[PDB]
Amino acid sequence: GKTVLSCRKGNGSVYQVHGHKRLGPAKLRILDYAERHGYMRGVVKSIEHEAGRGAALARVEFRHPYKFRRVKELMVAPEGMFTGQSVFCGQKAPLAIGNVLPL
Amino acid sequence: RKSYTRPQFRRPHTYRKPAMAKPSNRVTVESKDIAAFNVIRYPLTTDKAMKKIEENNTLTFIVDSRANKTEIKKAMRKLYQVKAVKVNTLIRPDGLKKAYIRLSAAHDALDTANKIGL
Amino acid sequence: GAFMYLNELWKKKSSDVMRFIQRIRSWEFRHQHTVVRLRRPTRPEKARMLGYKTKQGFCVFRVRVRRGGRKRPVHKGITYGKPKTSGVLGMKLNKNNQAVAEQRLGKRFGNLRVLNSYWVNMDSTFKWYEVIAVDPMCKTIRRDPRINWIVNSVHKHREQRGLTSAGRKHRGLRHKGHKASKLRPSYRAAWRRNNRIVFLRKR
Amino acid sequence: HMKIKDLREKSKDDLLKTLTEYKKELSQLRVVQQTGGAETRLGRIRPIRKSIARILTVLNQNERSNLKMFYADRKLRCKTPKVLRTKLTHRRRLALKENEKNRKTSRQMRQAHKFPKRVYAVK
Amino acid sequence: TKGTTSMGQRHGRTHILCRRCGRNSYHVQWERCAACAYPRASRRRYNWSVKAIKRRRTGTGRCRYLKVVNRRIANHFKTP
Amino acid sequence: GRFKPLAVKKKYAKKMNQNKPVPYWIRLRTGNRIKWNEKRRHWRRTKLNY
Amino acid sequence: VVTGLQEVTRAIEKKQARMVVIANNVDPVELVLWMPNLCRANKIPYAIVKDMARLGDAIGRKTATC
RNA sequence: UGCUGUAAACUGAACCAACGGGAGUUCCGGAGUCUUGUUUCGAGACAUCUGCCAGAUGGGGAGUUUGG
RNA sequence: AAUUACCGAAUCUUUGAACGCAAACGGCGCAUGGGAGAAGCUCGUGUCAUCCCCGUGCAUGCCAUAUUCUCAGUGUCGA
RNA sequence: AGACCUGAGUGUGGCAGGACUACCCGCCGAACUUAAGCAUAUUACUCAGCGGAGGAAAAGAAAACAACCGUGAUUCUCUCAGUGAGCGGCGAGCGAAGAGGGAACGAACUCGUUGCCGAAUCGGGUCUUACAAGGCCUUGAGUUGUGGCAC
RNA sequence: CACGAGUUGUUCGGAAACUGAGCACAACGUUAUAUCGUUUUGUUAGGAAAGUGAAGG
Numbered sequence A: 001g002k003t004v005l006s007c008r009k010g011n012g013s014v015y016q017v018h019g020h021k022r023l024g025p026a027k028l029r030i031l032d033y034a035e036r037h038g039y040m041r042g043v044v045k046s047i048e049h050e051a052g053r054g055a056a057l058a059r060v061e062f063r064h065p066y067k068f069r070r071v072k073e074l075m076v077a078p079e080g081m082f083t084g085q086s087v088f089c090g091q092k093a094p095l096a097i098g099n100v101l102p103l
Numbered sequence B: 001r002k003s004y005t006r007p008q009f010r011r012p013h014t015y016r017k018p019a020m021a022k023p024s025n026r027v028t029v030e031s032k033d034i035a036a037f038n039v040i041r042y043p044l045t046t047d048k049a050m051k052k053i054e055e056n057n058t059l060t061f062i063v064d065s066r067a068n069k070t071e072i073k074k075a076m077r078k079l080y081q082v083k084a085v086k087v088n089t090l091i092r093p094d095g096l097k098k099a100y101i102r103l104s105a106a107h108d109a110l111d112t113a114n115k116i117g118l
Numbered sequence C: 001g002a003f004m005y006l007n008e009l010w011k012k013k014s015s016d017v018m019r020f021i022q023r024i025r026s027w028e029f030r031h032q033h034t035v036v037r038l039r040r041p042t043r044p045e046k047a048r049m050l051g052y053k054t055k056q057g058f059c060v061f062r063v064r065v066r067r068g069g070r071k072r073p074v075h076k077g078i079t080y081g082k083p084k085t086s087g088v089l090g091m092k093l094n095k096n097n098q099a100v101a102e103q104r105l106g107k108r109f110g111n112l113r114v115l116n117s118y119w120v121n122m123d124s125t126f127k128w129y130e131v132i133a134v135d136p137m138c139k140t141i142r143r144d145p146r147i148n149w150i151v152n153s154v155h156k157h158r159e160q161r162g163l164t165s166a167g168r169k170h171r172g173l174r175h176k177g178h179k180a181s182k183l184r185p186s187y188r189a190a191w192r193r194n195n196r197i198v199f200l201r202k203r
Numbered sequence D: 001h002m003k004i005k006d007l008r009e010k011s012k013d014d015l016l017k018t019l020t021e022y023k024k025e026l027s028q029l030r031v032v033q034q035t036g037g038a039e040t041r042l043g044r045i046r047p048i049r050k051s052i053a054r055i056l057t058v059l060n061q062n063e064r065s066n067l068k069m070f071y072a073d074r075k076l077r078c079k080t081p082k083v084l085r086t087k088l089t090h091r092r093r094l095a096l097k098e099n100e101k102n103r104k105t106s107r108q109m110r111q112a113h114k115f116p117k118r119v120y121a122v123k
Numbered sequence E: 001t002k003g004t005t006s007m008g009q010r011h012g013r014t015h016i017l018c019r020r021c022g023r024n025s026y027h028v029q030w031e032r033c034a035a036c037a038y039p040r041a042s043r044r045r046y047n048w049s050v051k052a053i054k055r056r057r058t059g060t061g062r063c064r065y066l067k068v069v070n071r072r073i074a075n076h077f078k079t080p
Numbered sequence F: 001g002r003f004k005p006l007a008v009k010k011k012y013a014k015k016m017n018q019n020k021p022v023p024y025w026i027r028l029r030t031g032n033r034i035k036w037n038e039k040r041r042h043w044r045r046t047k048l049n050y
Numbered sequence G: 001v002v003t004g005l006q007e008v009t010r011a012i013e014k015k016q017a018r019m020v021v022i023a024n025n026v027d028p029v030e031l032v033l034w035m036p037n038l039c040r041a042n043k044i045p046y047a048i049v050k051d052m053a054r055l056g057d058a059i060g061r062k063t064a065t066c
Numbered sequence H: 001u002g003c004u005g006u007a008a009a010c011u012g013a014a015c016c017a018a019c020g021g022g023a024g025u026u027c028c029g030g031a032g033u034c035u036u037g038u039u040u041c042g043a044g045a046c047a048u049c050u051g052c053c054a055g056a057u058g059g060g061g062a063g064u065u066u067g068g
Numbered sequence I: 001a002a003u004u005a006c007c008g009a010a011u012c013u014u015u016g017a018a019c020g021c022a023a024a025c026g027g028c029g030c031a032u033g034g035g036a037g038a039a040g041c042u043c044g045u046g047u048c049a050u051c052c053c054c055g056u057g058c059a060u061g062c063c064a065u066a067u068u069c070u071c072a073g074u075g076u077c078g079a
Numbered sequence J: 001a002g003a004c005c006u007g008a009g010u011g012u013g014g015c016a017g018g019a020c021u022a023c024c025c026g027c028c029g030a031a032c033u034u035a036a037g038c039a040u041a042u043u044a045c046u047c048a049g050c051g052g053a054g055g056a057a058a059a060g061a062a063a064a065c066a067a068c069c070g071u072g073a074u075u076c077u078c079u080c081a082g083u084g085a086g087c088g089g090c091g092a093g094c095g096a097a098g099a100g101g102g103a104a105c106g107a108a109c110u111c112g113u114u115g116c117c118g119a120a121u122c123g124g125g126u127c128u129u130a131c132a133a134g135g136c137c138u139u140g141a142g143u144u145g146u147g148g149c150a151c
Numbered sequence K: 001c002a003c004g005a006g007u008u009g010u011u012c013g014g015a016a017a018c019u020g021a022g023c024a025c026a027a028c029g030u031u032a033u034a035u036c037g038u039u040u041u042g043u044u045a046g047g048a049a050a051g052u053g054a055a056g057g
């Protein structure tokens, strides 16, 4: 006989994801010294919708720990996040919707 | 070598001796008084060429196919002591390149054509 | 001389000190490239007995190969024809790893001449050999009467034709007499001799 | 029409002036070739082309000989441009020279001097 | 249908001229010649077609330099 | 149409130059075998395709 | 002094040597691994010192093993 | 036990040393010192690890047959 | 000699292993040496910015080397 | 500061990649066909595929035959021999070696190791008509060993 | 069919000089065999891939 379709899909020829309109991987900040020993504050700039995904995405701006620059991240938004909100990440963070803290 | 302020090492700056100039690997004798004869081949004698000579102060030449307008102007001045104010060029469907050369109003294309022997 | 001490010492590869030294060297080697250039041989006695001299035209390289048997390169592991030609994993290559290492170095660096090689180290994944090569355009090499035979063009890629020691080993030329009649001067030569049909003129 | 014997007894400058004169004449003859033209005039095109070829041959031969004489000196013999070296063949250039081969060891020399090949007859 | 009508549906070009061998065999989309394998360093050569080998081998062209190197070899590289 | 490379234009120019008949004195030469061109091309019969 | 591996070994194997100095950082260590055992099998006093570069500087070469 | 800030709950700014001390112009502090050395974290002589042998299963696939 | 034959001296367009970078482009560079330039400048000359033309070098890898080139390492020492 | 070890950058001098591939050397490697079916076997250590040289290539100087009154590197020819060898669903089929008559033949040498010496060696400048197997000079390489002489 | 002619650009279309779905040179790895693989989800490569502003004396 001939090859089955579930095995054909493993070459990923015409069966790969359609990602031209996507905005990129959604991830938290890098676990670095400031997050391990203190907290960092960011501000939510915009909330957007990406093709192929059911949840919203948030653009959050921080300050670079070492250079004079601005760093923009892209996370998955929790329910209740709004633009202009302040987000805290690290050890000394308070407890609120959107804050990132250790378990 | 003492203190590094970047998170990765990059090749240092060293001394680079510049490349010497070799003896030339060409031995042929080339003459500087000859190139214009290669640039310009011969004129044209058709009815359109004659009409242009009589009306627009323009001469028509077959030129080297790889030459450009600046070279054609310089060669025109060297070969015949005239000044060209415009050169328009086309490559013919048989492969040759043809130029329309308009002389400045201080020169008569009819006189130049008579000197050439047209 | 000192050669006897080095030879007798390298004949004890399973002692504690030699095993320690080889373990350190193996760890170090498996974090390097596939081909590496050396300034001096790791086994000076072995290199000298194989033909290396501390002169201006000789070089040493260390090459790495992968251990284990050979897998037949057929799509999805499917063969056709008679069942006797249907193994995919149990077959073995008809040429040894020393010859494969020599051939890899020679294919990569075409301006040198491969002379010999010897065993250096071993692992569960890799084997390491060291290859001696000479430069045919060096004045020292060209004027030394003991090595300048290799400048002639009939010696251009010896390792690709099987004329090194390892090539001779896997060709069968370590034997003579009744153990080698069908493979001398080569298998193809013996086959032609035994199989061509002869027509004498006045038969 | 230029004669080779007379051409060979001239300097570079005179050769260049003659080259310019002949090129100008040929360029003039092309115009006749385009605008009608008589057979006697058209018969002059080939001799002029061959004269130009002769002048160029003499110029180039003189130049090459002078350059080889320049680089003959042992001080500069190692920087001779490869267009002035002897071509032969790739393999002949790369092969062992007669001096490089035909060397032997001290022992081989001594043995060959101690036991040379003899001439003899049998009665 | 698939006969006369579908020959009018063929627009375009799969191959163009090759810079190395001059044939109309250069694949525009793959950038590779179906006759000489350009831009690979070596050329296509297969023993299952000796007719093609004999069509392409040495001596089917001009022998521009071989003509004179053979004469030099035959005359022992004589010089004044 | 309008676009073509210069290399293609030069190939077409060479073909145009070649598409000519045999001159008449060739047939008067001694030992002559040529009568017609026999490599004539017509745009409507055979296509160059380049 | 006697310099070079072969000459030093011959001097040790006879009784000519009165003392031997051995460098401690030779690259293939098998070149000198056996030397103290041989000097101890004979009755030759020996020492192991810090640098083959320093030994070479002492004798006028780049390095020296013994 | 390495430490300078929880305005934020509806979006400010922040770099390319001030200053102090020494023997014009450099060097120290500001900006703690050290290194039996590992970039850091997690596992760890197990195995998510390498190769070689052995046994099961295996129309997913190959070859062949299906008397008179 | 527009005769023939042979050969030692030469010439040898664009490509191609093709190798400065590209290529359904007769395209575009960096270094260096030249040429032409009634722009301007100067006393018909000389000189010349921008633009234009020509020669030479410039791929990757490997070997040898530097009157002894410039460096890097919490590798081993020693000031 | 410096030295050694291990690595970089640039300058200077070189070399490889391609073509040809009848014969020759190395690997990889079928099926049709025969067996009056077919699977071991045969076709065949063949065709196709991937590498590499020359004017020939490869082989070659005994860890060889023999069992004699003994031969004596390699290659090739006749013969040994379609074999009272042997292999084989012991079927179809396959299948050599020693000896003997010859061709060729000035056919033989070199490292490592051992012993005695220990830079006597190599590269680079320069001078002898000379990019000398010569002299003079050079730390450049080399003592982690280049070179010489012998049982 | 024969002979002779015809295509003119500072600004129009392209290139010089953008990025896209994508390709695959180097580097590295693999293979008896490179004519194989990775090479844009910021993005080569166990990975030293930057060659010139301001300068002053």
Ligand SMILES: [K+]
Binding pocket: none
């Ligand atoms: K590739």
Ligand SMILES: [Mg+2]
Binding pocket: B089, B090
């Ligand atoms: Mg135009």
Ligand SMILES: [Mg+2]
Binding pocket: none
């Ligand atoms: Mg041999």
Ligand SMILES: [Mg+2]
Binding pocket: none
């Ligand atoms: Mg035989």
Ligand SMILES: [Mg+2]
Binding pocket: E009
């Ligand atoms: Mg369609």
Ligand SMILES: [Mg+2]
Binding pocket: none
């Ligand atoms: Mg089945």
Ligand SMILES: [Mg+2]
Binding pocket: none
């Ligand atoms: Mg190119």
Ligand SMILES: [Mg+2]
Binding pocket: none
């Ligand atoms: Mg080749």
Ligand SMILES: [Mg+2]
Binding pocket: J033
């Ligand atoms: Mg058949």
Ligand SMILES: [Mg+2]
Binding pocket: none
């Ligand atoms: Mg059958």
Ligand SMILES: [Mg+2]
Binding pocket: J036
């Ligand atoms: Mg049948």
Ligand SMILES: [Mg+2]
Binding pocket: none
């Ligand atoms: Mg059948």
Ligand SMILES: [Mg+2]
Binding pocket: none
């Ligand atoms: Mg074949």
Ligand SMILES: [Mg+2]
Binding pocket: none
């Ligand atoms: Mg041979």
Ligand SMILES: [Mg+2]
Binding pocket: none
């Ligand atoms: Mg020796």
Ligand SMILES: [Mg+2]
Binding pocket: none
């Ligand atoms: Mg018509």
